Every structure is written in C-alpha cells, then in structure tokens.
Amino acid sequence: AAPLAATASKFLGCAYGAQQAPGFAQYWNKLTPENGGKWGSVEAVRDQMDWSTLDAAYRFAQANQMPFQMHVMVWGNQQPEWIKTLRPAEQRREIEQWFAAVAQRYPDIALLEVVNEPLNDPPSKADTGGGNYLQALGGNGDSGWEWVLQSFRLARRHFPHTKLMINDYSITSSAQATQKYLQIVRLLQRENLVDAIGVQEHAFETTPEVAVSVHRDNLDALAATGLPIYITEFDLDGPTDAQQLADYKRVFPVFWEHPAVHGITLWGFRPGLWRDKEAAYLIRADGTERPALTWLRDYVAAHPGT
Ligand SMILES: [Ca+2]
C-alpha cells in the first residue's frame, strides 16, 4: 500500500521506534525518532556517543526517501546526567559539541527541532534527566528567553543549511498561551533565528471543553508570522473505537485543512506509543485497523490540498 498522504500537498508522518516500525512506510511519509535523538540517549556517558537508535531512524528515513525531523537538541527531560554538576562554561562547551556532532553525522535533516517545550519544560531542573544547563545558555537574560536565543544561534552556526523549528504543547488551546509563544517567536525573528513553528497537539490539548474555533483562531495568529506551522505529536485517545472516531472527525480536519500547516506527525499508531494506556493507537494488538484509521485514510485521500 501507498502512504495515506502519498498524493497530498503536505506530509502525514509518525513517530518512529521499534514498536512503530511494522508497516510504517505503508502508512506514513515523514518521521521523527521517538527517543534516540534526545541528548541523554546519545551521550549517557560523557564523551561517548551511542548513535545506534538515531542511526536506525535516519537510515530508515533515507532508505524510504522521507523527510527526517531531528528530535531534539535542547529539552528539560532525557538530558545527560553528568552535565548537571558542571560549571556553566563547561556545560556550554558540551552543548556546542553536541550540536556539532549531530550536524556532522546527519547532513540531510529536513527539520531541526532545536528547543522543545520552552513554556512548559525548560532545562532548569536537576532531577533525573533534567540537564540543569539553563545558565550555560544565558538563563532568562534581558528578554526573558535568552537561553532559547542562544540555542537557535548555535543551531544557525552549526547547521547553516537546515530549517530550524521551535516546538511546544498547550498552545492553540488558549489565546493567552498563543500570545506567550508568539513573544518567543518575535524575539527569535529579531535575529531571523527560526524557520518553522511546531505545536504538539496531543489528546490532552484538544479535549472538547475548548471549541475547535479557539484552536483555528490561534493557528491563524501563529500563521500571521509568515512562518510554516507543523503539528508535531498528534494523538487522540480511544477508550472506545467510537470516542476515537468522533474525536478524529472533530479535531483532525481543523489542522489538516489549515493553509499554513505544512505537515502533521502522529505520535505513534501501534500499541506501545506514548499514550498506550489511553488507547491512542490506531491499529490493535491483533493487527487490525480501528474505525478512526479507516476514516483517516479516506479523509486524507479526499483532502489533498493546494
Ligand atoms: Ca561531549
């Protein structure tokens, strides 16, 4: 079979890892590595780089000619443990060496997710995987977002031909969150530091107590920057097949039909994805397609865009 978005104007991709691999290229035409590209995955031990899981994602993407999103340079979970007790100047050299290592090894990255979750999970904690390196990037600084500016500056320097993206959750569910995120975007745009705006859109962001008109209005606000939008980590819970179907019909089209949205990435489709307990998967354990996926195939084929 051909992937769902084979003939569409924008990609429909998915998180990739061992449980998501079966049939993957028969459905999806873009990928993000689920975990292997977090800095704690590669450099759990200082100065030894375990590229195995990341190379698996990249090699599969290349073999299938599908765009690769590198996930993720800077984040507040799954960072190396040993960096937390280094002095800021040494932490900074480690961050710069990580950015150089990824750019050397992976020259064909389609979208570089430089910072994830600046509003929600900055690298300011000293718990397990917290990183504790905010100060190595200038901290909040004068603008309140110095460390985000410094992350993007490093990305521009080390990846001079690569599209750079910011990513976060719980953005389009609130005008106030959208306006906070756009202030970070505005600061970045003073130095032309960012090329794309990501919003995750997990299930907990799209519940029906916020109308879809709110999300659509906040997409229009994000689009007014002139930058492409990407939906990065989309999922809908499936306590029953029918709840999952109803939610896909309600929510998915608002993002898919938005003219400034240039791709959607599902955050898994088979059991073992992040929201496994909430049954967000679209294929059951016995390999059969759920009603939401039957619908999604037909909906996407009917909505190629441009
Ligand atoms: Ca190092």
Domain spans in the chain, listed from the N-terminal domain onward: 1-306
Q: How far is the CA of 58 from the centre of ligand 1 (A)?
A: 21
Q: What CA–CA distance (Å, rounded) separates 25 from 39?
A: 26
Taking the C-alpha atoms of residue 50 and residue 39, their distance in angstroms, rounded to an integer, is 10
Please give the Cα distance from 179 to 222 (Å, whole number): 9
Q: How far is the CA of 96 from the centre of ligand 1 (A)?
A: 9
Q: In angstroms, what is the span from residue 98 Cα to ligand 1's centroid?
A: 6
- Put the strands of the sheet holding 229-234 in their side by side order: 31-33, 11-16, 261-266, 229-234, 196-199, 163-167, 111-116, 69-74
Q: How close is the Cα of 215 to the center of ligand 1, in Å?
A: 41
User: Which fold, 1-306?
Assistant: TIM Barrel (3.20.20)
Give 1 Cα–ligand 1 centroid separation in angstroms. Answer: 43
Least Cα distance to 30 among 207, 203, 198, 251 occurs for 198
Report how far residue 92's alpha carbon sits from residue 208's, in angstroms, rounded to the nearest whole number: 43
Resolution rounded to one decimal, in angstroms: 1.3
Q: What distance in Å separates the CA atoms of residue 202 and residue 232, rounded to the nearest whole number?
A: 9
Q: Active-site residue numbers?
A: 117, 233
Inter-helix orientation angle 212-223/175-190, to 10°: 10
- What is the enclosing helix (H) or strand (E) of 266? strand 261-266
State in Å: Cα 115 to ligand 1 middle.
Answer: 19
Q: How close is the Cα of 75 to the center of ligand 1, in Å?
A: 17
Angle at 94 between CA 91 and CA 95, to 5 degrees: 90
Is-cis flag, bond preceding 199, omega within 30?
no
Residues 21 and 34: their CA atoms lie apart, in Å, by 11
What are the respective helix, strand and coil percentages of the chain, to the nearest 5?
40, 15, 45
| Six token digits for residue 49 | 């780089």
CA 198 – ligand 1 centroid, Å: 28
Compute the distance between CA of residue 230 and CA of residue 110 in angstroms, rounded to an integer.
Answer: 13
- Residues with Cβ < 8 Å from 122, sequence gap 6 or more? 76, 134, 147
Length of the chain: 306
Tokens read off for 156: 């521009």
